[PDB]
Amino acid sequence: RLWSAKAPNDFNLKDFNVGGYIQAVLDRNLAENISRVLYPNDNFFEGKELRLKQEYFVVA
Amino acid sequence: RKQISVRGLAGVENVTELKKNFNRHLHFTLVKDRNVATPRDYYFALAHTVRDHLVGRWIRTQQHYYEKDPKRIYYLSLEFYMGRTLQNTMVNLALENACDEATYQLGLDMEELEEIEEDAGLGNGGLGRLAACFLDSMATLGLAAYGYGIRYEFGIFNQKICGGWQMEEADDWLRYGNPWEKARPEFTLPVHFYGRVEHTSQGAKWVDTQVVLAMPYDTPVPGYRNNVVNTMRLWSAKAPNDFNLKDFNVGGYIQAVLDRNLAENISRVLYPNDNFFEGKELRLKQEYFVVAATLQDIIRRFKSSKFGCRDPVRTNFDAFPDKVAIQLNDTHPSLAIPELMRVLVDLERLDWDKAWEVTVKTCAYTNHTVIPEALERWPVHLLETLLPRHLQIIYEINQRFLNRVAAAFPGDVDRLRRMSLVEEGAVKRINMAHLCIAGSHAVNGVARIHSEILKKTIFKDFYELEPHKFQNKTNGITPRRWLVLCNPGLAEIIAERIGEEYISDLDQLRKLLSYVDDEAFIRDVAKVKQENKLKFAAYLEREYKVHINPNSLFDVQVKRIHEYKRQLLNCLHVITLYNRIKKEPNKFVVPRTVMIGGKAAPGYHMAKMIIKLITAIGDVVNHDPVVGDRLRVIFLENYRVSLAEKVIPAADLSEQISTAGTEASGTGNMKFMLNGALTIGTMDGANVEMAEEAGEENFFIFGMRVEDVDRLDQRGYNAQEYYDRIPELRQIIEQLSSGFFSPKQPDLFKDIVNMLMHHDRFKVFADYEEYVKCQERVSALYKNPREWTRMVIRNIATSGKFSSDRTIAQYAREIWGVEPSRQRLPAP
Amino acid sequence: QRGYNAQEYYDRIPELRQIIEQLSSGFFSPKQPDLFKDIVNMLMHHDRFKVFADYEEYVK
Ligand SMILES: *Cc1c(COP(=O)(O)O)cnc(C)c1O
């Protein structure tokens, strides 16, 4: 059983944050890309906040 | 190789094999079991066990259209209001009773499972309902048609009422997969946005564009027991997914996130017309997208259904009008006309005047406005950035068209500034309506008084310069969805007298006229209307709640909540009946259940103040102890195709009250008629033809007619001058603004009292006496059940002019130039 | 309290008749005649601020 990330697609009115603003065009994207790219260890270029986001994703 | 064959699969139409084919899918397709399954599971499972039977014939039809290479008719539209597919697919293929018996011996309930399907989140109202009606007749008339449109991931919002106020939830009707579609990745296509026009010596080119991928999704559409099942190719945008380096551009900024969200939400949302908030780049972005991934799939088809062979002129488009017809439902495909011209002149290379007769012979436009401002108009600056080659084209079309125009009316110059494609002025714009007519051969309106008012005012100077174009095809309804599956009890007795024949050509229903006086027929029509009403009382408590009294006159108005459709008139007479019942209590009122339904439109403030006026009226009248069941006002929630399949069969009177001369036709109109209800209406839209088929004497017409709407305008309507005559109007207005209907916010409905009183763009108050007059005539005759039912019999035996099979045959024959057959065609 | 009907003055005053006239006819704009149709329909029909009512006593 494998997990793929999906962002809540509520973005044009949920929580009533929007209309006014989409910084959140990025929640759906650095989220959709927690599962796009593999990121293999003992290397990589800099202990990226994306990998800590993939591993606690797989776990939760 | 030849043993790879459809021939073999599926055995007998046996509950027997159907129970068995239902167990495979539950386990092998769903990978579910008995113990872990949901009703949603068993629906998906049944909906795959219909589907095997469904797709085998779609294989066979389309391959039968390869070999017999017919002309193809592409019904092109931004909105397919498709509704629900399990029962209509079971009844268009004969399965209902085998599936019914199957699931029943399998321990389950079908009417139950059927209810777990959710309306294909894919259209918004009129324009699209019609598409999905035209789509089913287009099948059933043997026609070679294709529906082409945008697959909307989340349709057009949901209506939830809270606080009395409308609230809009999102519909992610794609949330558990939609069984009916077969996602087609293999046939994706680039649509090119933005870019530059560089003129090579051999031609011009549209260089340096943004590309968006147009992936196809394919849904079958079966006809009524004839075996053609046609295609509905629907498109979803997908940005190119190379996002870290590709173009040797990034490692720097990612702005690039935005194509994968501004291409991505080209198919993520309906933007429904004659409104919206601002003629955004996104809607022009979407018109071109459904159009461009389609003229492309069109031509591609054209070159390959045995067509290197049906040449005989360098695969020429000489035989393209022969073998293709493109119908432009409203000015929403407006660009397939110049996208046709870019694709023939540049990419192939036909000369600019041989690529033209091909275009203008290959297209037709269906019009649906009557008040002109409403017509489409994109600012040219927009068109320049976004579709630059196309604005190159619409301009030379304009240069030629205005020169044909003077090749005909010399000296007139002032006509040229009216028949151009450009509206100079405030900010320069390209009036898509002219483009459509110019680029076409046939220009049909959708009702006789409508197709005439086009002809004579709106599109007048075109009428003059070319008569042959302008057609009509009044609007129509399909008897299979709107009689055989929504009202099988009314369906049943019409067949119990005159056999099923009618289903397939609705003029046989005129035979029903003769049983007007067979006393048994009459008790049967009302046995049925009592049956349908008492399922609705029931749904109206079980799944949402009130205390509907079965025996009341079911007053229903299901409209888009706009100001010109008048539910305010309708609210004023309920506040009026509420006052008589409260002034003198012991008097006989025929009790009514008034049910208004329809979605508002976000950002329409007035439309939202009305939905609240109605629910507020609802807490007073439905709670006040004097009034009993004598009245209830019910606001109907999240009105949509399956709800209407529920309400319309239980309606006794339906409120067609739009200001005379505002509507091209009305299709709900026809559903209520075929379904046993008196109509109460202004003379307008499609009322006129339904009055002339049924006879005025059976229709509850009233109010201002076009003539005297015009005339009130010349003297100038002053709502206070009617308010001044009529006491009860003052009684009810003064309750609105006294805060009678909103106890804790007094000045609340002030929004509506002022608008009514001084700024009424639509003459609510004018038609107030006459409206409550016809209504008393309605209440009066419902007191006489052999005669209400005797009227209903006249009104419904008269439905034939209103099946979409008629409308479509006149399309098929007079425009799409093909004769619509109705031959069974074979299958395994 | 009386409902300002604008077309009313329209009909006494021959001048005013004659100047709403010229505007929408297309007098004051022959390349775009229709143009001040807006203003016409504002004045003859939806005028909140009562232009035609203060005309004559102003002209005068
Ligand atoms: C048929 C139908 C329409 C048509 O409404 P009109 O009264 O013709 O404008 C729209 N919505 C639903 C749900 C329908 O069933």
Curated annotation (Swiss-Prot), chain C:
The chain holds residues 724 to 783 of 843 of the full protein. It comes from the Eukaryota. This is Glycogen phosphorylase, muscle form. The gene is PYGM. Belongs to the glycogen phosphorylase family. The modification Phosphoserine is found at S24, S25. Allosteric enzyme that catalyzes the rate-limiting step in glycogen catabolism, the phosphorolytic cleavage of glycogen to produce glucose-1-phosphate, and plays a central role in maintaining cellular and organismal glucose homeostasis. Homodimer. Homotetramer; to form the enzymatically active phosphorylase A.
